[PDB]
Design a protein around this ligand. Structure first.
Ligand SMILES: Nc1ncnc2c1ncn2[C@@H]1O[C@H](COP(=O)(O)O[C@@H]2[C@H](O)[C@@H](COP(=O)(O)O[C@@H]3[C@H](O)[C@@H](COP(=O)(O)O)O[C@H]3n3cnc4c(N)ncnc43)O[C@H]2n2cnc3c(N)ncnc32)[C@@H](O)[C@H]1O
Ligand SMILES: Nc1ncnc2c1ncn2[C@@H]1O[C@H](COP(=O)(O)O[C@@H]2[C@H](O)[C@@H](COP(=O)(O)O[C@@H]3[C@H](O)[C@@H](COP(=O)(O)O)O[C@H]3n3cnc4c(N)ncnc43)O[C@H]2n2cnc3c(N)ncnc32)[C@@H](O)[C@H]1O
Ligand SMILES: C[S@](=O)c1sc(Cl)c2c1C(=O)CCC2
Ligand SMILES: C[S@](=O)c1sc(Cl)c2c1C(=O)CCC2
Lengths: 676, 672
């Protein structure tokens, strides 16, 4: 409670602070979050009195906080040299560094404290000392710069010359990345301070051929500064290398042209710049700078998409300005489709092909697009989100480049299956959707506008959800999930009908006529579960992935055969557990009277010794028996009337799979279901 | 080649080249099909008065449009030599013709500061106050609509800005389709003299200073962030400027003033009734060591998703830190996940999303190949999600999805889960994910080069993901080094099947034979052998190796093969059992009838030979009847049949697979 009262040292009311200690108070109590002590806080205030009042009570001036800084190293920042006088007699070393390396002397340089700089110099400060930081920091080649380098980057022109002339500072010292003070100097935005520090460093021997960020020579940071004075000052040096290139291969002259700098280019050419680092005239001409055009003539990428391959080769070929990491041109040739706002165009994000949805910089829907995308990057069935880039007035959200709408995809593949072949494709597309929407739901978003033009297919026939511009965080309103699940219902019928019924016809039908439009009992059941998912929605989608709809025909036949191989079915044991589940209590199904709807020959041949009864038990027994012997050669005749046996039984008995499914779902006999 | 000698000549400045060419019959309206440029266009962009004139004697259209829609007249507004504007004016239908983005010749003179053409187009009917009419896609994002004034203001053209407001009746508060006025454009020119002088000239004329620009920032707010007190003071001369207006992020002009270390600028917004508590201003001044501003006020939620790193990610979000582009990061042990070759990997915040961030020196060769590879991997669902990179100008920060556990940790946490001989579905799931990821990585053209359990990650939902592309390479350069990844996968197979009990590091010291011999079963031995001896899409096919078949599936396959007609009738010369016998060494199931319990054996003979067929037939028959009530005693000696046959004949599944691998009987294999 009484060490809460160090609040009093920042109210600057000295008269409480005396009482604090007498009442019982620790003057070295360090607040545990960042390490702040009273003396620490006192010296950042420049309060001559509080320094005196609590060194009177033993606050250590070599006490380190989280960052490693002592009140002495901080006193170099406030720059009042009387507080340096008050705690110097009690410091072990005037050249003590914090964990990033900053000394009292170096902090005087950063903050331009010119008379605090003076006291520490002839008091033993190491003028040329490079900074010692942490080991994680030194294998990234960080640290090592000097007070000179510090004064140069903070424009403290006064500090630089005092350091260079009164105190023998190494002008061409480098830090752990080879940066000299010259480099630090050329990143101050103020042009006057830059120019003066540069001459003050050049006249004394600073290496004018040094490298900094992005392998840029000083001369290159000068042209990219658009500051002709710096250029002429650096080219007054014999040993300047005018055709040095940066990381991306550009020379000082090339960029000078690119940025439409007439005089700056005119001067690099007039001083022996290499004119063949590129097509120089063509850049000036595209810049509508015909005065340079006149002066300068006097001296493999592979796209991945097939559909868009040829256009993305054209967009790679042409020149375009970059919007951050993105290369784009608004032209019909690169337009993929029309959106509410701005179309979606092809683009190049970090040299990768992408689709680009465009919003107004402040568009609420663009907000919601990026919010949802940013929460979905783990959702493997959501379009890959590369990132967004702003023009300052158009938000470019960049997405993976898919090949086809779901609707286009179905149209191109409508002829793929023979009219009654297993539709493996529908199962996969809808299953990805079921995953995509379920994971989207778990991440807290609901799509709100599911429809085939929002589902895209890639070069690998993966299906992906998209267009989150209308999504909503659903925690606020939890019943709103159920729209996605209804749309998913229509999407099941939409995809199973191979696209032959337009989505807009389905969105106008009632729930019942959509169920009625289903081609089989599996699909009818799945749609029904989507239209009535329960107020307890939770993760209903993940469970429906076990619906027989998703069982291959082989798996449904394997499961009928396995249920029919249970001991109590073959022995027709009516009071067994298995047959009490399947046929209890007395019938209006397709397999009532089933023995009277099998070909008369296969039937009686199959009575290879009473006979087969009209129980469902024996029909499973039947399917089991015929499954085991279909390919034996005494039955080659019978193999040909049945055709594929799975297809045979499902078509003569459309409700069979569903019926055995329903009766065994939460029983020990679920073990016979296929694996999911 | 007639008109491509003519288009060579119009830029050779060769006056007499172009004369013959044209008379000879060259088309003076020829448009190069890339961008639409005509000779007349190039002549006017060039400022060659002589060539423009000669190309009108031969009928060049001054209203001919190139790709953006610009005519040679509209281009003449840019070069700004009024002599060619006079030469093409009698032949333009309208002095106010726009290109497809809305630009008129008048607006172009404004943009390029060509003041003497600006006058020429004034007295010839130019619409000074025209807003730009642009494309449909551009206007549904509210782009376009800007004016000549807005153009001159944004390009510092002090000379052009004064003539539009005084001599030519320009609307000072005209607005664009985004509500930006000329004031907003003016305050974005980098030059301080040019900016400061243009700002005075539009405030005195009636520009509304309570407008919005980029990021909903008011003119006053762009002034603070300019750190230019002079600008601040002139907008501060209008009483109804609203000083407590808030931007996109809820910040006021006064809030930014302290944050940016602006003693003089802040002292002034307070003296103008700025709302002092939109955040703790004194805490920001003191954090900045600006004891001179602490002395002036002197006088007057987020949910982390990770569990393992959740509490630390709550602490990192809570504190203040500067941003590096989109990244919030603090270098401290408390936020350290692990240490790498260069710089450690720390927790971070990328666009307010939790992320792990690997750090390199700005120029590191290694940081390159990680970023090259990560950038190519976004379609790879089993490579860790790559958020983006940010450079501080001397450290490249690579930002990744935040997983919960290394594979070695994950196996350790689940080591006590399984009873000592249970089917290891976990091992199959982890390895297949690895198999997909390395195969998809290889298909994208990269090889990982340092596969090891510490580079494989497991997330909160027990999925596996690859990481550490810092030593990756584009493998076309050396297509053999692919086989380093495949060997590591071999070791990784044994490592995971041994549940983490044998260190990788022991595994790296064993010989190939010591890894094969150390394997618990024939599936694992065979799979590893193929990774050490492959034949560039080999990984995807091995996902169908019986190693990845469940025990039920393996027993299901032998039962099914054991049901082929020519096995049950022992048709000796049929194709199925011609495929089944070699040459080959001896197997554990030669003489197999003498390794079944005498009771089960005898019960089932009611002529089982040592053929492999009748063992498959045996498997098939017993599988069908095990559970009947006459066979309860026999059900009890065999137990679970799949485990029984695999333990009594450890080389059976591999053997049947190999003999049927690329035959029609491949159909009995489980579907993969
Ligand atoms: N009286 C108080 N009581 C209670 N709490 C307080 C009080 N006062 C402030 N607080 C709260 O503490 C929090 C911060 O604690 P701190 O200021 O003592 O420690 C800083 C930071 O945490 C910590 C590390 O920050 P970082 O991760 O960005 O690390 C910085 C950078 O990455 C690296 C660069 O070195 P180099 O590459 O140039 O060689 O070293 C750090 N650094 C850069 N310039 C520095 C400088 N002049 N002096 C010291 N360190 C510098 O060091 C302090 N710090 C950082 N930049 C600073 C700078 N320009 N000037 C002065 N100090 C700076 C504050 O945010 C605040 O909330
Ligand atoms: N004589 C030649 N013969 C053959 N080829 C040539 C020749 N000269 C140049 N080339 C090659 O043509 C290629 C680019 O074509 P282009 O310059 O003719 O057409 C540009 C672009 O295509 C096309 C669309 O480019 P963009 O999507 O980046 O769109 C720009 C902007 O986003 C959009 C709306 O702007 P705003 O009103 O919201 O501000 O209009 C463009 N625009 C900007 N400033 C413009 C200006 N002053 N005047 C007219 N349009 C301007 O418009 C041309 N363009 C762009 N910036 C321009 C600018 N500052 N000044 C003049 N024209 C500009 C060049 O690459 C070059 O290789
Ligand atoms: C990645 S983008 O989402 C995309 S690619 C592609 Cl083809 C289309 C779309 C759409 O939205 C709808 C129009 C067709
Ligand atoms: C994306 S990073 O690669 C990462 S996340 C994470 Cl937990 C760990 C790692 C490691 O390297 C090893 C330590 C654990």
């Amino acid at each position: 409670l009484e060490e809460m009262l160090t609040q009093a040292v920042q109210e600057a009311d000295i008269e409480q602070v005396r009482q604090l200690l007498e009442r019982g108070a620790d003057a070295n109590f360090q607040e545990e979050e960042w390490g702040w002590s009273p003396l620490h806080s006192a010296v950042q205030m420049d309060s001559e009195d509080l320094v005196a009042l609590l060194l009177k009570h033993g606050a250590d001036p070599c006490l380190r906080k989280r960052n490693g800084a002592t009140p002495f190293i901080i006193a170099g920042i406030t720059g009042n040299v009387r507080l340096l006088q008050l705690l110097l007699p009690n410091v072990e070393d005037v050249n003590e560094c914090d964990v990033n390396g900053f000394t009292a002397f170096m902090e005087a340089a950063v903050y331009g404290r010119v008379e605090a700089l003076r006291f520490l110099y002839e008091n033993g400060a190491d003028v040329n000392m490079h900074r010692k930081t942490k080991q994680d920091q030194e294998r990234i080649r960080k640290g090592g710069a000097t007070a000179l380098m510090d004064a140069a980057e903070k424009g403290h022109v006064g500090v630089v010359t005092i350091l260079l002339h009164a105190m023998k500072a190494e002008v061409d010292a480098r830090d752990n990345m080879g940066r000299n003070a010259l480099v630090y100097a050329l990143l101050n935005p103020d042009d006057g301070k830059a120019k003066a520090i540069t001459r003050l460093l050049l006249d004394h021997g600073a290496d004018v051929n040094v490298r900094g960020e992005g392998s840029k020579t000083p001369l290159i940071l000068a042209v990219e500064r658009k500051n002709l004075d710096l250029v002429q000052m650096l080219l007054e040096q014999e040993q300047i290398e005018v055709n040095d290139t940066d990381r991306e291969g550009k020379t000082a002259l090339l960029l000078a042209v690119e940025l439409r700098l007439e005089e700056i280019a005119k001067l690099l050419c007039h001083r022996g710049a290499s004119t063949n680092c590129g097509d120089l005239v063509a850049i000036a001409r595209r810049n509508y700078d015909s005065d340079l055009v006149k002066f300068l003539r006097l001296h493999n990428w592979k796209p991945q998409s097939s559909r868009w391959g040829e256009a993305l080769k054209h967009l790679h070929r042409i020149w375009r300005p970059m919007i951050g990491k993105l290369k784009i041109f608004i032209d019909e040739e690169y337009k993929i489709a029309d959106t509410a706002e701005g179309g979606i165009y092809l683009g190049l994000y970090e040299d990768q092909e992408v689709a680009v949805k465009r919003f107004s910089e402040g568009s609420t829907r663009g907000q919601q697009e990026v919010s949802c995308l940013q929460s979905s990057r783990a959702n493997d069935n959501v379009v890959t989100f590369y990132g967004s880039e702003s023009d300052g007035s158009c938000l470019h959200v960049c997405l993976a480049l898919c090949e086809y709408t779901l609707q286009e995809h179905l149209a191109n593949h409508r002829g793929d299956a023979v009219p009654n072949e297993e539709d493996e494709s529908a199962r996969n597309i809808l299953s990805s959707l079921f995953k995509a929407i379920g994971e989207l739901h778990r991440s807290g978003y609901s799509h709100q506008d599911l429809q085939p033009q929002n589902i895209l297919i890639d070069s690998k026939n993966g299906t992906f959800l998209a267009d989150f511009d209308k999504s909503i965080k659903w925690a606020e309103d939890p019943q709103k999930i159920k729209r996605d699940l209804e749309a998913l219902g229509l999407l099941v019928l939409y995809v199973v009908k191979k696209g032959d019924i337009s989505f807009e016809t389905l969105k106008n039908q009632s729930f019942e006529e959509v169920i009625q439009g289903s081609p089989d009992e599996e699909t009818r059941d799945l749609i029904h579960h989507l239209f009535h998912p329960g107020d307890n929605v939770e993760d209903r989608l993940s469970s429906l992935l076990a619906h027989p709809f998703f069982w291959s025909w082989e798996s449904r036949y394997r499961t009928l055969r396995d249920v029919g191989n249970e001991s109590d079915i073959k022995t027709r044991n009516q009071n067994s557990r298995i047959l009490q589940l399947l046929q209890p209590g007395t019938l209006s199904t397709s397999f009532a009277q089933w023995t009277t709807k099998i070909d008369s020959f296969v039937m009686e041949e199959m009575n290879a010794y009473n006979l087969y009864q009209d129980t469902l038990g024996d029909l499973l027994k039947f399917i089991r028996n015929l499954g085991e012997h279909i390919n034996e050669q005494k039955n080659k005749k019978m193999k040909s009337i049945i055709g594929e046996p799975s297809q045979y039984f499902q078509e003569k008995f459309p409700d069979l799979v569903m019926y055995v499914y329903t009766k065994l779902q939460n029983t020990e006999y679920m073990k016979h279901f296929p694996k999911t």
